[PDB]
PDB file of N, CA, C and O in Angstrom:
ATOM      1  N   UNK A   1      16.038  -3.031  13.936  1.00  0.00           N
ATOM      2  CA  UNK A   1      16.732  -3.556  14.138  1.00  0.00           C
ATOM      3  C   UNK A   1      18.097  -3.229  13.587  1.00  0.00           C
ATOM      4  O   UNK A   1      17.725  -2.081  13.226  1.00  0.00           O
ATOM      5  N   UNK A   2      18.631  -3.751  14.547  1.00  0.00           N
ATOM      6  CA  UNK A   2      20.472  -3.245  14.697  1.00  0.00           C
ATOM      7  C   UNK A   2      21.359  -4.754  14.169  1.00  0.00           C
ATOM      8  O   UNK A   2      20.667  -6.156  14.987  1.00  0.00           O
ATOM      9  N   UNK A   3      22.456  -4.286  13.747  1.00  0.00           N
ATOM     10  CA  UNK A   3      23.345  -5.640  13.787  1.00  0.00           C
ATOM     11  C   UNK A   3      24.686  -5.044  14.166  1.00  0.00           C
ATOM     12  O   UNK A   3      24.968  -4.246  13.181  1.00  0.00           O
ATOM     13  N   UNK A   4      25.617  -5.624  14.809  1.00  0.00           N
ATOM     14  CA  UNK A   4      26.997  -5.504  14.746  1.00  0.00           C
ATOM     15  C   UNK A   4      27.528  -6.692  14.923  1.00  0.00           C
ATOM     16  O   UNK A   4      27.311  -8.381  14.528  1.00  0.00           O
ATOM     17  N   UNK A   5      28.628  -6.569  13.626  1.00  0.00           N
ATOM     18  CA  UNK A   5      29.493  -6.999  13.304  1.00  0.00           C
ATOM     19  C   UNK A   5      31.329  -6.730  13.253  1.00  0.00           C
ATOM     20  O   UNK A   5      31.475  -5.871  13.568  1.00  0.00           O
ATOM     21  N   UNK A   6      31.891  -8.135  14.381  1.00  0.00           N
ATOM     22  CA  UNK A   6      33.350  -7.827  15.025  1.00  0.00           C
ATOM     23  C   UNK A   6      34.424  -8.670  13.848  1.00  0.00           C
ATOM     24  O   UNK A   6      34.266  -9.867  13.454  1.00  0.00           O
ATOM     25  N   UNK A   7      34.875  -7.863  13.441  1.00  0.00           N
ATOM     26  CA  UNK A   7      36.126  -9.046  12.493  1.00  0.00           C
ATOM     27  C   UNK A   7      37.259  -8.006  12.429  1.00  0.00           C
ATOM     28  O   UNK A   7      37.003  -6.627  11.920  1.00  0.00           O
ATOM     29  N   UNK A   8      38.383  -8.496  12.406  1.00  0.00           N
ATOM     30  CA  UNK A   8      39.606  -8.482  12.237  1.00  0.00           C
ATOM     31  C   UNK A   8      40.195  -6.933  13.148  1.00  0.00           C
ATOM     32  O   UNK A   8      40.343  -5.691  12.320  1.00  0.00           O
ATOM     33  N   UNK A   9      39.314  -6.721  13.959  1.00  0.00           N
ATOM     34  CA  UNK A   9      39.565  -5.500  14.612  1.00  0.00           C
ATOM     35  C   UNK A   9      38.709  -4.427  14.353  1.00  0.00           C
ATOM     36  O   UNK A   9      38.794  -3.318  14.389  1.00  0.00           O
ATOM     37  N   UNK A  10      37.162  -4.718  13.759  1.00  0.00           N
ATOM     38  CA  UNK A  10      36.865  -3.886  12.949  1.00  0.00           C
ATOM     39  C   UNK A  10      35.241  -4.080  13.773  1.00  0.00           C
ATOM     40  O   UNK A  10      34.480  -5.030  12.690  1.00  0.00           O
ATOM     41  N   UNK A  11      34.256  -3.849  14.433  1.00  0.00           N
ATOM     42  CA  UNK A  11      33.455  -3.449  15.271  1.00  0.00           C
ATOM     43  C   UNK A  11      32.310  -2.243  14.361  1.00  0.00           C
ATOM     44  O   UNK A  11      32.274  -1.134  15.246  1.00  0.00           O
ATOM     45  N   UNK A  12      31.478  -2.279  14.056  1.00  0.00           N
ATOM     46  CA  UNK A  12      30.511  -1.603  13.625  1.00  0.00           C
ATOM     47  C   UNK A  12      29.088  -2.009  13.697  1.00  0.00           C
ATOM     48  O   UNK A  12      28.727  -3.021  13.694  1.00  0.00           O
ATOM     49  N   UNK A  13      28.073  -1.062  14.331  1.00  0.00           N
ATOM     50  CA  UNK A  13      26.418  -1.363  14.628  1.00  0.00           C
ATOM     51  C   UNK A  13      26.040  -0.302  13.585  1.00  0.00           C
ATOM     52  O   UNK A  13      25.287   0.525  13.450  1.00  0.00           O
ATOM     53  N   UNK A  14      25.133  -1.531  12.367  1.00  0.00           N
ATOM     54  CA  UNK A  14      24.469  -0.892  11.411  1.00  0.00           C
ATOM     55  C   UNK A  14      22.980  -1.605  11.839  1.00  0.00           C
ATOM     56  O   UNK A  14      22.811  -2.598  12.008  1.00  0.00           O
ATOM     57  N   UNK A  15      22.135  -0.367  11.682  1.00  0.00           N
ATOM     58  CA  UNK A  15      20.710  -0.316  11.735  1.00  0.00           C
ATOM     59  C   UNK A  15      19.913   0.377  11.163  1.00  0.00           C
ATOM     60  O   UNK A  15      20.414   0.984  10.103  1.00  0.00           O
ATOM     61  N   UNK A  16      17.973   0.013  10.480  1.00  0.00           N
ATOM     62  CA  UNK A  16      17.969   0.110   9.920  1.00  0.00           C
ATOM     63  C   UNK A  16      17.764   1.470   9.476  1.00  0.00           C
ATOM     64  O   UNK A  16      18.384   2.739  10.026  1.00  0.00           O
ATOM     65  N   UNK A  17      17.646   2.387   8.126  1.00  0.00           N
ATOM     66  CA  UNK A  17      18.024   3.442   7.809  1.00  0.00           C
ATOM     67  C   UNK A  17      18.261   3.675   6.296  1.00  0.00           C
ATOM     68  O   UNK A  17      17.701   4.148   5.560  1.00  0.00           O
ATOM     69  N   UNK A  18      19.748   3.637   6.683  1.00  0.00           N
ATOM     70  CA  UNK A  18      20.142   3.634   5.041  1.00  0.00           C
ATOM     71  C   UNK A  18      20.663   2.334   4.734  1.00  0.00           C
ATOM     72  O   UNK A  18      21.765   1.787   5.328  1.00  0.00           O
TER      73      UNK A  18
END
């Protein structure tokens, strides 16, 4: 799966792997 977190104008998509 993947996870998206947005804070302080910082959005990123972290998915399984590393």
